[PDB]
Amino acid sequence: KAETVKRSSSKLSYKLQRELEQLPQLLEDLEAKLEALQTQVADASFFSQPHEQTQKVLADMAAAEQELEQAFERWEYLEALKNGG
Numbered sequence: 001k002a003e004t005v006k007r008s009s010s011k012l013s014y015k016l017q018r019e020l021e022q023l024p025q026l027l028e029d030l031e032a033k034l035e036a037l038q039t040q041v042a043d044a045s046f047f048s049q050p051h052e053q054t055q056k057v058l059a060d061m062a063a064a065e066q067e068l069e070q071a072f073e074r075w076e077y078l079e080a081l082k083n084g085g
Contacts, residue, residue, distance in 0.1 A: 011085030012078075020078040023071060030068035037061035 012020070040046050040057050047054055 007085060010081075012082045016078055016081065020075065020082065023075045023078065026071055027068060027075060030064050030071060034061065034064040034068055037064055 037057055037060055041061055046057070
């Protein structure tokens with residue numbers, strides 16, 4: 001009892017240090033990833049491939065954008081946390 005962390009050391013942890021420092025690279029990764037996938041799916045010749053090829057790219061495409069935005073608000077969370085914790 002009363003050994004809690006009352007936001008004494010919570011503004012960042014090392015695990016967030018390496019989280020926040022790699023995450024930007026990951027953002028542009030996933031953005032370029034989405035970019036790279038959306039341009040495949042952009043062409044009508046894309047859906048000329050078998051379902052197992054196309055859905056591979058389609059699913060990976062949708063995963064890229066979702067990963068990106070979620071990682072982005074994770075990033076801004078870590079940024080905000082680093083400023084106020």
